[PDB]
Amino acid sequence: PENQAPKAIFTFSPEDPVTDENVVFNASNSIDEDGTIAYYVWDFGDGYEGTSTTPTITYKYKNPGTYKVKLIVTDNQGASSSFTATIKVTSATGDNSKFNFEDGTLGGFTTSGTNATGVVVNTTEKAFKGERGLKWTVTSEGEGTAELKLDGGTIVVPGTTMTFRIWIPSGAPIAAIQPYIMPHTPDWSEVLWNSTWKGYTMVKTDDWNEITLTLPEDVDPTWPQQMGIQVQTIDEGEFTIYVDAIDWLE
Amino acid sequence: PENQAPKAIFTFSPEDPVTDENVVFNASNSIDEDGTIAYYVWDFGDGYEGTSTTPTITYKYKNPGTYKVKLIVTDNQGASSSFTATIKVTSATGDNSKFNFEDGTLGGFTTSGTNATGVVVNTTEKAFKGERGLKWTVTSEGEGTAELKLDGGTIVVPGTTMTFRIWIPSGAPIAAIQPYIMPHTPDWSEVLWNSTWKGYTMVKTDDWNEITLTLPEDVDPTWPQQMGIQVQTIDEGEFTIYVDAIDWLE
Ligand SMILES: [Ca+2]
Ligand SMILES: [Ca+2]
Ligand SMILES: [Ca+2]
Ligand SMILES: [Ca+2]
Incomplete structure (x- = not known):
């Protein structure tokens, strides 16, 4: 050579x-x-x-x-x-995300809560990708919980890692926030809970936060699923969270 | 009922x-x-x-x-x-990480660079998990590159997501940092490059940064691999990066 x-x-x-x-x-x-x-x-x-x-x-x-x-x-x-x-x-x-909110629709998402009340609209005010996202306003009355959620046929296959983008404001009466996925039997007699818990102090305030969550590979693939974001509140107040571009592969 | x-x-x-x-x-x-x-x-x-x-x-x-x-x-x-x-x-x-540095050893890691010189020791000064990590000191002479690296049999299987924890100081003459994985033929005639590029402005200074990197699933599983962290320098200066708890499943 x-x-x-x-x-x-x-x-x-x-x-x-x-x-x-x-x-x-x-x-x-x-x-x-x-x-x-x-x-x-x-x-x-x-x-x-x-x-x-x-x-x-x-x-x-x-x-x-x-x-x-x-x-x-x-x-x-x-x-x-x-x-x-x-x-x-x-x-x-x-925005090519699984939930991109570009059609101007809520995508089946609703709100619930206890000692807190939520409203959600499709908004152009803030988005993570494209022009549109969800705008989620929560009024707390004290120690409570509020959800932005989707029921819940079979949203993801077991094993799937989902990515949520959440815009979290400063000065809010919140203790913790967590995206979740909750498979359950059709009769709701058996519920599985999966979440990525984040303390309010471990989060980027007045900015977009990217939070991942995996549905365990051993979950029954035929169980209906609720997917959402839960906020734990600790005092009275009104705050607005923005949610966009919830995404996963396949 | x-x-x-x-x-x-x-x-x-x-x-x-x-x-x-x-x-x-x-x-x-x-x-x-x-x-x-x-x-x-x-x-x-x-x-x-x-x-x-x-x-x-x-x-x-x-x-x-x-x-x-x-x-x-x-x-x-x-x-x-x-x-x-x-x-x-x-x-x-x-520390149960794949590379945990608890034995007091470098784990095969060495340094190289151009227009920059690196030294690495096993340290107790900072760690991400357990008592020990790597302490990597870089002297830059201007625009340059420095690596903390391991050659490089078959370190991970294709498809694997690796997690690096990197402590990055403020006031450093750096432009970018990136963990990398570089499969290559034994003769080095063919090299594959995989990295997670992070600008210096998009990084938590004086704090631990968790950066993930995936080896694509289609890489030949028999090719030897170099794994490491590359820093791009932009001016003269001396800075210290801490690296610990490089980890993956299997
Ligand atoms: Ca030649
Ligand atoms: Ca969008
Ligand atoms: Ca009863
Ligand atoms: Ca360690």
Whole structure:
């Protein structure tokens, strides 16, 4: 053996592109130690490939998704090395979440509570993705509980990790908040409870909070499910929580 | 039909118990609407069951884990309802992480960098879990890169989500930080790159940061892997990052 294969590597910018946004891929740290680079071949992971005459190339993805970008660097003697990185493209406008609230509807969500009363509307005031979300206003009367909830056919398969985005205000009479999933027999004689409990002091106030919750893989897949967010209240007061972009795979 | 079955429900405290810590389960919101409750039967999910003569019962778990706690409430006429919640118990002392650093060793981790130099030691100064972690000191000379890394047999199976805990200081000459996993052919002619990129402005400074990263399920399971943390530097300076409790399931 004798010719040394080239070093292949690239970075890209921006790291978090949106659809139809220019991404610049930069292979300039690639090098052939004992010769020169003859080809930069790019596979964009979407069905298209091309080459650059310099170490940089720009590209755009029209569809959201996670793409494998492969660079092959080939030297002046035909020896090659490759480097593959993953790039995530999210939708520039709109919201592809399982519950995205873009149709202007509540998506079956209602409110309940004890020593607290809730109302929910579809809102354009705040959203996590797209233009629309839910706006959930709670009036507490003291120590109590309030829910924003959906009954409850079979919402997720067992094993599924759900992601909730919750906008939680400062100065609110709350002790804790928790997304939940509650499978139950049709007759409600047996109830299963799954939640991600978060203390009010362990939460980003006046900001969006991303909270995950997994339905255990051993739950009966045929049991109807209630999905929702529960707030524990500790004093009198009126506060507004925003909920959007509840999402999971499949 | 005529007898109404009871309402069964409980809460517990603390929500985040450690091993051998008292947990108080409280079924006091359970009620039989048309009679009285005769039995509170508790299944603690660990092999043990018991009853309480009041709505409350205390229990301790000696082993860490996630337990299903089932309450069955039975009324004065033998009708019952059940409510099952999950409780997570973590170890009171020590560290069960895949990389826990409790043996006082580096666990195969080394440092590299360009326009930056790193040193790493096993430390008791800060840890995320248990008594020990890694202490990683980086001297930058300008725009550069530094890694804390492990080569790299087959560290995780494809599909695995790894959790890194990284303590990131304020006032550091850094632009970005990212845990990574880098499968490669034995000859290094083909490299795959997976990372969770975080800007310095999108990170909790002077605090522990929990960052997850998934190795894609389609990676060849036989390729050797480099796992590590990469810091991008932007100016001269000396900064210290603490790393502990890198963890995944299986
Ligand atoms: Ca060469
Ligand atoms: Ca939305
Ligand atoms: Ca009864
Ligand atoms: Ca440790």
